[PDB]
Design an enzyme around this catalytic site. Sequence first.
Site, mmCIF file in Angstrom:
data_model
loop_
_atom_site.group_PDB
_atom_site.id
_atom_site.type_symbol
_atom_site.label_atom_id
_atom_site.label_comp_id
_atom_site.label_asym_id
_atom_site.label_seq_id
_atom_site.Cartn_x
_atom_site.Cartn_y
_atom_site.Cartn_z
ATOM 1 N N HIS A 12 0.702 -1.278 0.000
ATOM 2 C CA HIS A 12 0.000 0.000 0.000
ATOM 3 C C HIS A 12 0.729 1.327 0.000
ATOM 4 C CE1 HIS A 12 -3.462 -2.559 0.472
ATOM 5 N NE2 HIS A 12 -3.011 -3.030 1.621
ATOM 6 N N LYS A 41 -4.087 -9.956 -8.076
ATOM 7 C CA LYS A 41 -4.799 -9.485 -6.900
ATOM 8 C C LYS A 41 -5.915 -8.631 -7.499
ATOM 9 C CE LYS A 41 -4.111 -7.601 -2.359
ATOM 10 N NZ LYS A 41 -4.636 -6.237 -2.089
ATOM 11 N N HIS A 119 -3.179 -3.592 7.941
ATOM 12 C CA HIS A 119 -4.240 -3.875 6.984
ATOM 13 C C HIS A 119 -4.906 -2.595 6.499
ATOM 14 C CE1 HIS A 119 -3.911 -8.116 7.255
ATOM 15 N NE2 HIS A 119 -4.361 -8.221 8.493
#
Length: 124
Positions: A12, A41, A119
Amino acid sequence: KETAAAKFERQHMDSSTSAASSSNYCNQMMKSRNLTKDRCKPVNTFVHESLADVQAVCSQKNVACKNGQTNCYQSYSTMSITDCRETGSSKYPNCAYKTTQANKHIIVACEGNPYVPVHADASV
């Protein structure tokens, strides 16, 4: 094995650019960050802010996670991000992604000591 924090960083973080100024951004990033190995993904977001700014979110607005857990935090400010999503023409190993640049609040789950993002739980 990759640590949760390190995986979050790889999947990310993209502080090298202020924003995705090209339709091919996602195709390139998903490939270089190794998110298209063995399979494409489906969805993935990259944040264009400093790692420090993203880590700081862990001490900002505490909010519920999608799963109900309570270790999620929403950034006080919006951040430049790019959402990557597979297109209909996508077929591994020839993954194809739509690049959507935007400015929104990010929501991350944090854990550990140091207490850091592990996350990505969406963005508002």
